[PDB]
A paper describes a structure:
The MyD88TIR microcrystals were studied in parallel using SFX. The MicroED and SFXb MyD88TIR structures, which were built and refined using the same protocol, are almost identical, with a root mean square deviation (RMSD) of 0.4 Å for 138 Cα atoms. Minor differences in some side-chain conformations can be observed, which is most likely due to the flexibility of certain regions resulting in poorly defined electron density or as a result of the difference in the data collection temperature.
MyD88 and MAL are Toll-like receptor (TLR) adaptors that signal to induce pro-inflammatory cytokine production.
Residue numbers in the entry: 159 to 296
Amino acid sequence: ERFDAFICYCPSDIQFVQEMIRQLEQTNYRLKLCVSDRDVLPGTCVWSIASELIEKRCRRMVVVVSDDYLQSKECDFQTKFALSLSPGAHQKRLIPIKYKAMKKEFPSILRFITVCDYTNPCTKSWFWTRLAKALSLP
């Protein structure tokens, strides 16, 4: 009915989505993440159910950015639809995440929003803390 965040990801990054479920849902943060392969019911229009969840049934949206993420078209529609809700990031709704080594360019439409970097070994301690705090604010 009401989720804390929608998780935009390609099938190749589903392994890190499991970590996002263990670290945020099964811990003391008690966040309510929306995973399409788990919570989206079959028979729904992939564009209409994404437009209905991201805009009304999810406060924010997490984007797992990787090289395989760029090749995904469904993630492309969800990412651009998320920016359309607040271009300029006034509401802090679009939270991109980099967990893997990317040999391609970061999405140019997301180059002006803070990214939660998981690959930097000097800031791994604050990764889940900053992520769970952003999804917890109203």
